[PDB]
Design a protein around this nucleic acid. Structure first.
Ligand SMILES: [Mg+2]
Ligand SMILES: [Mg+2]
Ligand SMILES: [Mg+2]
Ligand SMILES: [Mg+2]
Ligand SMILES: [Mg+2]
Ligand SMILES: [Mg+2]
Ligand SMILES: [Mg+2]
Ligand SMILES: [Mg+2]
Ligand SMILES: [Mg+2]
Ligand SMILES: [Mg+2]
Ligand SMILES: [Mg+2]
Ligand SMILES: [Mg+2]
Ligand SMILES: [Mg+2]
Ligand SMILES: [Mg+2]
Ligand SMILES: [Mg+2]
Ligand SMILES: [Mg+2]
Ligand SMILES: [Mg+2]
Ligand SMILES: [Mg+2]
Ligand SMILES: [Mg+2]
Ligand SMILES: [Mg+2]
Ligand SMILES: [Mg+2]
Ligand SMILES: [Mg+2]
Ligand SMILES: [Mg+2]
Ligand SMILES: [Mg+2]
Ligand SMILES: [Mg+2]
Ligand SMILES: [Mg+2]
Ligand SMILES: [Mg+2]
Ligand SMILES: [Mg+2]
Ligand SMILES: [Mg+2]
Ligand SMILES: [Mg+2]
Ligand SMILES: [Mg+2]
Ligand SMILES: [Mg+2]
Ligand SMILES: [Mg+2]
Ligand SMILES: [Mg+2]
Ligand SMILES: [Mg+2]
Ligand SMILES: [Mg+2]
Ligand SMILES: [Mg+2]
Lengths: 117, 64, 201, 144
RNA sequence: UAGCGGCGAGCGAACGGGGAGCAGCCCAGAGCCUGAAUCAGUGUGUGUGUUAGUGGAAGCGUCUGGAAAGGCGCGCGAUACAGGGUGACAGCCCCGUACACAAAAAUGCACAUGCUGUGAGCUCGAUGAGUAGGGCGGGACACGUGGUAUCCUGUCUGAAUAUGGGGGGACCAUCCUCCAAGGCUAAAUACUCCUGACUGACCGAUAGUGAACCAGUACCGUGAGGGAAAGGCGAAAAGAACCCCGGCGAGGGGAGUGAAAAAGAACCUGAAACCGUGUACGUACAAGCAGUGGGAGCACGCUUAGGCGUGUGACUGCGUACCUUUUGUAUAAUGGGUCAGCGACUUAUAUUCUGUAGCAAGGUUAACCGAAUAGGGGAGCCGAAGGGAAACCGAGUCUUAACU
RNA sequence: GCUUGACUGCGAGCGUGACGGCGCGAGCAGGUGCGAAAGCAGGUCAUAGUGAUCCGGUGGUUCUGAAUGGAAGGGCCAUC
């Protein structure tokens, strides 16, 4: 029962090579190089599924601080005021409001200033 | 082909009823006079192979 | 335990244990697999590094060339070299215990009775040695793929069926477990039922 | 019941290990052999009884005993066997006919193993006490 | 297993049983009986086969298609549906196959019979000498000189001779058993340079023979010797008339052939590395495993608007390859220029454990026979009893004078 | 002072060792010594003072004894 390996080997190589589209040089052409670039991309992505959550929160907070600072209060005091005011609007939604609804944000700031007074 | 029994081991061990192995004790061949009577007496009966060594003996005695 | 002859009002009593036992698939599977292993002509070989024709000369020296160290032009790593675990002829046959084979035969026959694949007749006679006469008989009995099991080899019947690919005519002693499973229907003469019952019991 | 509806019993056909066929299998690379020793090497492994050069047990311990040639021509017989002979009599020679004892056994002994439920005559054989009583308790006639 | 064994590594019987197949004869001498057994050749007759060969069944219509054997439909033969071919897959087109037949000539193996040679049958005799055995040295016997029988003999010796000798594992005695020193002998057994037929859970052009091909060639080597690579147009050559560019070129474009030339001989299919042309997007103030997450803009499609799809990817967070070997490697430690192909835990026998199946205090047969994967064969192996160095005893045994 | 317990067969149970093994041990049987007796004694206050197996040697032991009776050799016990 002799088994030629060409058809299954070609597929195994093509799958990786398809995953390596857009990569520079040997990284999109050569299997030995391509397989290492695909695995690395996977590792980075997996890392980036977690990293993204940290980055987006980092962005929201800087956006909230700016608006809050614009409206008169630091981020630190602002989130404490919303806590003591029982407000459970998350950082994703505060930062959307800071950009798109500046008067609604002002209201959330006065509520925080109130619960701190 | 057939496993070859280690002939030297076939001359030192014998299989007991529950699969164990009896063997004659060491230190009773010669230099007997400086050894206490009591030490010689306990060496006269056949002891059983300990757990650590039954693998070696069974390996050597396949047709036992 | 009883078998209705398709062509008679009369029935034939037989043993429940041979025609009425349960279907043990595992035992049957082991016996059908052994039969196929027993049918293998295990005739092949390859050449190990020793059997490849060529010299034992080192192709190049061990050290000083930047080449990979080599020792044999017949190394299995090398194109034209030997097969690492080159095949030899081997017998693929298996031991079937006497009782396991009879046990599977009894199981198979019981399962043909349960599945109505066993037909029983007083006799299965073709008069002259012609397919045309037998093919009519099997078309009148509503049979296409069928193993005919007679007690006695009828010369006319073996010949008349030889050119029919889906028909095989055997003696009671010629049964095998595969042919009982392989054909759609099994037709057994009354006297063949007697022989098989005595064989197996 | 056709040639494509026949399975083996579950648990009857284990896969079979394949070494050095990749990471996922769990037997890839070194294929279960670990790293860098005699045992790793192809055809690597010390012989049976080698204990690293320490005087091994089979030679550390003394030889004992001799083999009696008599024991090989001496067979024990169970009471269960006394019914397996044809004719009620139990001689050394009719025990050979019943494949109880070897064809080269010259001495035979009936021991108290199993039960005899028959009148049996035992001739030219030896009989244990316990065995002598089981024979006598069933119509037995032991004859020296 | 018994044994042999620096009692190490390892070597490894026989007795006896089951089977295959069996076949017994002659000389060492005389006489009566005489060619009466027996193969050997060497003729002939009759059968048998080989070496060439003969016949050998039965199908049309329609659909697709370059082409039908394919589809559909309705038929026919089959002791032939083994196979191989034919413009795609044919029981019925072909070659064949089953079955039936066949030899002028030569020849094989069997028989019958004839010429020539060899002698049985009877009767009474005869019973293999530098031999057996021994010493010395060696070898062979499973057996390493060991307590070592037995066989062989290089050397030195050297009997008895049927009232006698050899052996029965030191040796002696007794008992049994055979009769050396002279020979022949079929079958069961071994093998396959070669031939024929058939088969294959064998390979299918880096495989399989080294060699599918003009291969033991080319080539290397003083020589012995070493030793490649290299298969495929098409159904059919129908292998591209003729015209045009070009050097009466190479090569190409048309034309024509063909189902296909996107099958044109550098020819089935025609992957990958590698190299190019074209289009989209980005890129000339920008620093690093070149990705990843975010993400504008642009291009191109979508959606009846809809923050979605594809390609590109400015800018930005994170981010020093893989393997190996290591306490530890971005490591300036090892290996890899790349692609493709090949390239490594097998096989056989033993043994044990597990699972699973069968039978079960019984289980199972091996060789072999063959009613051939059946059935037969139970010779054997394991298990149901062990203890003891052993005799021996025995559900107990050993130990000890005997055991709390 | 008297003596040979520097006894023989065994040994509940512990300890210490990967193993080989080493060690401690009441008590039992037999026989002994000391002591009026209870009792003590299976070597020395203890912990070092040693060498596996093989191959042999010696003595004992009718265990085995390659047809059988023996023997050789082997085994077993003690010791080298
Ligand atoms: Mg000794
Ligand atoms: Mg090859
Ligand atoms: Mg069989
Ligand atoms: Mg792991
Ligand atoms: Mg390694
Ligand atoms: Mg290491
Ligand atoms: Mg290791
Ligand atoms: Mg038997
Ligand atoms: Mg032999
Ligand atoms: Mg013809
Ligand atoms: Mg024809
Ligand atoms: Mg000599
Ligand atoms: Mg002689
Ligand atoms: Mg006689
Ligand atoms: Mg003579
Ligand atoms: Mg080749
Ligand atoms: Mg190819
Ligand atoms: Mg070659
Ligand atoms: Mg080649
Ligand atoms: Mg031209
Ligand atoms: Mg092509
Ligand atoms: Mg091309
Ligand atoms: Mg710029
Ligand atoms: Mg740069
Ligand atoms: Mg960085
Ligand atoms: Mg290092
Ligand atoms: Mg280092
Ligand atoms: Mg690091
Ligand atoms: Mg560098
Ligand atoms: Mg270096
Ligand atoms: Mg490196
Ligand atoms: Mg390198
Ligand atoms: Mg006492
Ligand atoms: Mg001291
Ligand atoms: Mg002695
Ligand atoms: Mg003798
Ligand atoms: Mg004797």
């Amino acid at each position: 029962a002799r088994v030629k390996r060409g058809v299954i080997a070609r597929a195994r190589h093509k799958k990786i090579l398809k995953q390596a589209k857009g990569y520079y040089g040997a990284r999109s052409r050569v299997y030995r190089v391509a397989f290492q670039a695909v695995i690395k991309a996977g590792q980075y992505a997996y890392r980036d599924r977690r990293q993204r959550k940290r980055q987006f929160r980092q962005l929201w907070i800087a956006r909230i601080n700016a608006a809050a600072r614009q409206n008169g209060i630091s981020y630190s005091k602002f989130i404490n005021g919303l806590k003591k005011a029982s407000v459970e609007i998350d950082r994703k939604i505060l930062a959307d409001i800071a950009v798109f609804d500046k008067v609604a944000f002002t209201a959330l700031v006065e509520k925080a200033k109130a619960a701190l007074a | 082909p057939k496993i070859k029994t280690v002939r030297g081991a076939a001359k030192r061990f014998k299989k007991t009823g529950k699969g164990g192995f009896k063997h004659k004790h060491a230190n009773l061949r010669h230099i007997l006079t400086k050894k206490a009577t009591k030490r010689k007496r306990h060496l006269r009966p056949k002891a059983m192979v300990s757990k650590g060594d039954l693998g070696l003996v069974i390996a050597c005695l396949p047709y036992a | 335990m009883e078998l209705v002859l398709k062509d008679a009002q009369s029935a034939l009593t037989v043993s429940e244990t041979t025609f009425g036992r349960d279907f043990n698939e595992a035992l049957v599977h082991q016996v059908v697999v052994a039969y196929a292993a027993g049918a293998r002509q295990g005739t092949r070989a390859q050449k190990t590094r020793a059997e490849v024709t060529g010299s034992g000369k080192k192709p190049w020296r061990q050290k000083g060339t930047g080449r990979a160290r080599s020792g044999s032009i017949k190394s299995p790593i090398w194109r034209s070299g030997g097969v690492t675990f080159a095949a030899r002829p081997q017998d693929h046959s298996q031991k079937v215990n006497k009782k396991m084979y009879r046990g599977a035969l009894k199981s198979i026959l019981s399962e043909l009775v349960r599945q109505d694949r066993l037909i029983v007749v007083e006799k299965f006679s073709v008069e002259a040695p012609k397919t045309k006469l037998l093919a009519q008989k099997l078309k009148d009995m509503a049979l296409e793929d069928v193993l005919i099991i007679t007690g006695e080899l009828d010369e006319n019947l073996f010949l008349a069926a030889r050119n029919l690919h889906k028909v095989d005519v055997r003696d009671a002693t010629g049964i095998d477990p595969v042919s009982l499973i392989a054909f759609d229907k099994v037709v057994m003469t009354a006297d063949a039922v007697k022989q098989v019952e005595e064989m197996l019991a | 019941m056709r040639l494509n509806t026949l399975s083996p019993a579950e648990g009857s056909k284990k896969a079979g290990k394949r070494l050095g066929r990749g990471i996922g299998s769990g037997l890839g690379k070194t294929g279960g052999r670990g790293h860098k020793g005699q045992k790793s090497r192809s055809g690597g492994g010390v012989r049976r009884g080698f204990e690293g050069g320490q005087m091994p047990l089979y030679r550390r311990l003394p030889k004992f005993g001799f083999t009696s040639r008599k024991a090989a021509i001496t067979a024990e017989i169970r009471l269960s066997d006394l019914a397996k002979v044809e004719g009620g009599v139990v001689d050394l020679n009719t025990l050979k006919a019943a494949n109880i004892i070897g064809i080269q056994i010259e001495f035979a002994k009936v021991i108290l193993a199993g039960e005899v439920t028959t009148p049996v005559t035992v001739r030219g054989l030896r009989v244990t006490k316990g065995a002598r009583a089981a024979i006598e308790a069933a119509g037995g006639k032991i004859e020296e």
